[PDB]
């Protein structure tokens, strides 16, 4: 009762004795490495704080300090980015001519002929061509100097030191008690209001006072070295008044509720700025102010030290209906006592958020001169897609882990978790039927197209030239969004994106965004997306549901979350755990996200990206997606054989590195197969012969070479498979988009 601050003083002593002795955290790991399996389990169980202590207080404290360490690492990373922008980048040269200078921020040394990697990017500069979109970000912030990047990098280094000090302090000097961590209402109140709310409000203040006059002058077109420094704009309303007249009235309209007078910088326009190809910074100012107010409102819902407010538990307990029995009874207790439950929820929502970010950033480019930077477009989209997919698979894994370790049937009686666990066969049966049906009517359609094309019967295959499959619903939604401004969005002057329809937004002779048409090929690829997503969710859901028990192995949860098998009995029980379900879900997520990024790349290179020639848009590939994507041979020939020409012919250029990784990744992927098709027994007996060879010469180790465990063999295999595949696609995309575009 009563949310308050509670800490233990000096719980842990800051020594170096435990660094001298590896494996101190785990009782089983202690007593020396008798075999190399000890070496592997030392790392595999380093962060598994559950198996190092049963006290939820200690688990929570370790999690808190680890989060501080992660924040420190992220601040080191940001400091590195800003420092490289300040020193080894052509940012100041790129500001003057953002349309023809290729962004760069990493130079290499002369050491072994690698100097060739220094591209002739522009601005009288030589270096690798970055694709992280940092230049557009900095310009949107309103930087326009290389001293400001140095100041930001040094400030980020100081803040990294602060993060590391905070982690050390809150583990070793003043560590929170468990009842501090369990104040979820107060943490939610502070993450809705204080974090997201005040953060959005502060960013709106920055944009209003820094990013808006500076970028206004740059967009009018001025050498940045003449523009007044941001504090000059901030401190006197005279300059802003000459740029934005409403600043001549000050804050009086704000406190008089005559807010319409701020309409010159608080606009509702939508669309893209014609000169930059990005959203209006006035629109984003208004957006951040609005959502900051909305989050400050959101952060007052829950009850703390005063009577007003709602209780999460009371709200949860009151949502019960006829179809659910007890409903959300016990959900509160299984969320404020298990970290893996929160990790599953947060990872799922975070990966979905990343994917949404990717979508909303290709369609509606938010930074100046970022749409025209095709490399930045493609790289940012693909990167956020992959990050989202990984986070989603992690959500599945940690849902399984909670279902194995932190789930007790005593408090989960006839509530929602119990109801779901009590009919899992129905869910899995129907989801498997959906996967079958979608797989057939998505891939068999492509195979029918292939067979009809190979037979010389194009009048039979599904295409715009023959049997049509037109996305009527998607097209209707596109039209509805187009017709919004002035109808259902009366105060919006233009559509939110030039992808619904309208005109072609082209910047600097390059198309920024033009309407995207959906046809039979788009229908087919969307159903391919649905099929892959459904099989992935089937794998992960089946793992979560049958984590505890199964009609095959009822005592599965007694074997733990991560175990190889249960013997060759019952016909064979290989990969029956939840961990192996995550292991297969990784492969299916890879397949899903890979098809998604292939679809994005081909559709954008074929129907959006290109150059305007004063008479029409000449796309990079010429529109072949609409007619060639209907067949598998079309993807193998018109997208994968054709567009690989820029990566295999990259030797002796600045993209030569992309030519190496493209090959090198092909190695890693293939190498992964070693670990995925083989089994531990072969390797153990091979290592036995090797150890005999060593014994014959008195060079055998005292630490036993042991072949990798079954679980570790599978983990190594999947890690290498994903690494090889993702690196191949990354290098191919980058070389293609940095040689054309």
């Amino acid at each position: 009762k009563k949310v308050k601050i509670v800490v233990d003083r000096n719980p842990v002593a800051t020594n170096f004795e435990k660094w001298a002795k590896p494996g101190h955290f785990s009782r089983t790991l202690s007593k020396g490495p008798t075999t190399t399996t000890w070496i592997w389990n030392l790392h595999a169980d380093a962060h598994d704080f559950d198996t190092q202590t049963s006290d939820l207080e200690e688990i929570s404290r370790k999690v808190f300090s680890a989060h501080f360490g992660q924040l420190g690492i992220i601040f080191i990373w940001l400091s590195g980015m800003y420092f490289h922008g300040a020193r080894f980048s052509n940012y100041e040269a790129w500001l003057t001519d953002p349309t023809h200078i290729k962004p760069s921020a990493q130079v290499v040394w002369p050491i072994v002929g690698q100097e060739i990697l220094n591209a002739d990017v522009g601005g009288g500069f030589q270096g690798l061509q970055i694709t992280s979109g940092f230049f557009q970000l900095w310009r949107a912030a309103g930087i326009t100097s290389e001293l400001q990047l140095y100041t930001t990098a040094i400030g980020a280094l100081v803040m990294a030191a602060a993060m590391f000090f905070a982690g050390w302090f809150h583990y070793h000097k003043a560590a929170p008690k468990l009842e501090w961590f369990q104040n979820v209402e107060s943490m939610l109140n502070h993450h809705l209001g204080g974090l997201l709310g005040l953060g959005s409000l502060a960013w709106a203040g920055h944009q209003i006072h820094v990013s808006l006059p500076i970028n206004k002058l740059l967009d009018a077109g001025v050498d940045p070295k003449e523009i007044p420094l941001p504090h000059e704009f901030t401190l006197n309303p005279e300059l802003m008044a000459q740029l934005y007249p409403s600043f001549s009235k000050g804050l009086a309209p704000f406190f008089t509720l005559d807010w319409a007078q701020y309409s010159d910088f608080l606009t509702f326009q939508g669309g893209l700025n014609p000169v930059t190809g990005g959203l209006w910074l006035t629109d984003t100012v208004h957006h951040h102010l609005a959502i900051a107010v909305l989050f400050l409102i959101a952060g007052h819902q829950y009850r703390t030290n005063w009577g007003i407010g709602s209780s999460l538990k009371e709200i949860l307990e009151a949502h019960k209906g006829p179809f659910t029995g007890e409903g959300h009874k016990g959900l509160y207790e299984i969320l404020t006592t298990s970290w893996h439950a929160q990790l599953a929820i947060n990872l799922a929502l975070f990966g979905s958020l990343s994917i949404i970010v990717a979508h909303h950033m290709y369609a509606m480019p938010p930074y100046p001169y970022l749409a025209t930077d095709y490399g930045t477009q493609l790289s940012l989209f693909t990167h956020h897609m992959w990050i989202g997919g990984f986070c989603i698979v992690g959500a599945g894994a940690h849902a399984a882990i909670f279902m194995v370790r932190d789930y007790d049937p005593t408090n989960n009686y006839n509530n929602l978790l119990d109801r779901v666990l009590r009919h899992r066969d129905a869910i899995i049966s129907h989801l498997n039927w959906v996967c079958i049906f979608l797989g057939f009517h998505s891939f068999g359609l492509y195979i029918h197209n292939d067979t009809m094309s190979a037979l010389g019967r194009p009048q039979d295959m599904f295409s715009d030239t023959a049997i049509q499959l037109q996305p009527v619903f998607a097209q209707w939604v596109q039209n509805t969004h187009f017709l919004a401004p002035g109808f259902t969005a009366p105060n919006a002057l233009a559509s939110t994106s030039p992808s619904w329809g309208g005109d072609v937004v082209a910047v600097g002779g390059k198309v920024a965004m033009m309407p995207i048409s959906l046809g039979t090929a788009d229908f087919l690829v969307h159903h391919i997306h649905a099929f892959t997503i459904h099989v992935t969710v089937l794998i992960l859901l089946k793992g979560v549901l049958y984590a505890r028990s199964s009609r095959l192995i009822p005592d599965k949860a007694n074997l733990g979350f991560r175990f190889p098998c249960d013997g060759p009995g019952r016909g064979g029980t290989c990969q029956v755990s939840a961990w192996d379900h995550v292991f297969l879900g990784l492969f299916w997520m890879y397949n899903s996200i890979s098809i998604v990024i292939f679809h994005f790349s081909w559709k954008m290179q074929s129907d959006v990206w290109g150059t305007v020639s004063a008479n029409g848009v000449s796309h990079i590939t010429g529109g072949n997606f609409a007619q060639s994507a209907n067949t598998i041979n079309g993807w193998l020939r018109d997208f994968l054989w054709a567009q690989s020409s820029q990566v295999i012919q990259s030797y002796g250029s600045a993209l030569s590195a992309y030519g190496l990784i493209f090959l090198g990744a092909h190695f890693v992927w293939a190498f992964s197969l070693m670990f995925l098709f083989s089994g531990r027994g072969y390797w153990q007996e091979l290592i036995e012969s090797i150890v005999w060879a060593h014994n014959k010469l008195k060079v055998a180790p005292a630490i036993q070479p042991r072949a990798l465990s079954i679980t570790q063999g599978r983990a190594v295999g999947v890690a290498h498979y994903l690494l090889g595949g993702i690196a191949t696609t990354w290098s191919f995309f980058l070389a293609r988009i940095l040689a054309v575009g």
Binding site: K4, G250, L251, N305
Partner: protein, 241 residues
Amino acid sequence: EGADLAKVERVAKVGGLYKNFTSGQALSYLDGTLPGDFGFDPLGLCDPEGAGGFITPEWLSYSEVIHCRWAMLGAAGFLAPEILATAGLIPATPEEAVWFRSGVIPPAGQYGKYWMDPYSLFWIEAILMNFAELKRWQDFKEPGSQSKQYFLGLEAVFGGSGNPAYPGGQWFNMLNLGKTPEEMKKLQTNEIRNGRLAMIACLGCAAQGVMTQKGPFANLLEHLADPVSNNLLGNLATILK
């Protein structure tokens, strides 16, 4: 909860707009000791259970006293240059003897006639205040030290007392004022009330300086001139002009 009635009877006995802002949690640990204890604690920051780090009843009380002393110094030093210039006793135009145009913030103004440039004065300030504050801190941690090691004979006056906020040795209490512990408590409450008033005054002076770009005494005079038009609401149009 419903208060304790007898506990909050003492807060009603200090009078004023207090009792209106005190809570049952506060009265569990604010019983009248520590001067200036009127029970105002809406957030339970001085709660002794689960104390640690810098959120302790001792550190918080010590910091409040240190702040009130620094703020009384700062309020007197905010008012004195401007009133002395407006009175014409000192040679500086009243728009140049303003506290924030003294070189503390070079963008906001400067007084380039110091016997050294501001950065070197800050260097000597850093060294001297490092001595003073580090000695004060090590006396807070070890409540009796700083009087054992040599210091040109100064170590005689650095014994301190019980409460770190009131060392009152041979130097810190030269005049030996408040010879009665009751009179000592009364004077402590004088010091804390004046110090809190000065905290509010210093925050007000900074906010007015941003808000009106003039001096605190000039703001006071221009408010007394026309109260209706020269006020917070009237100045809302011209704020950094």
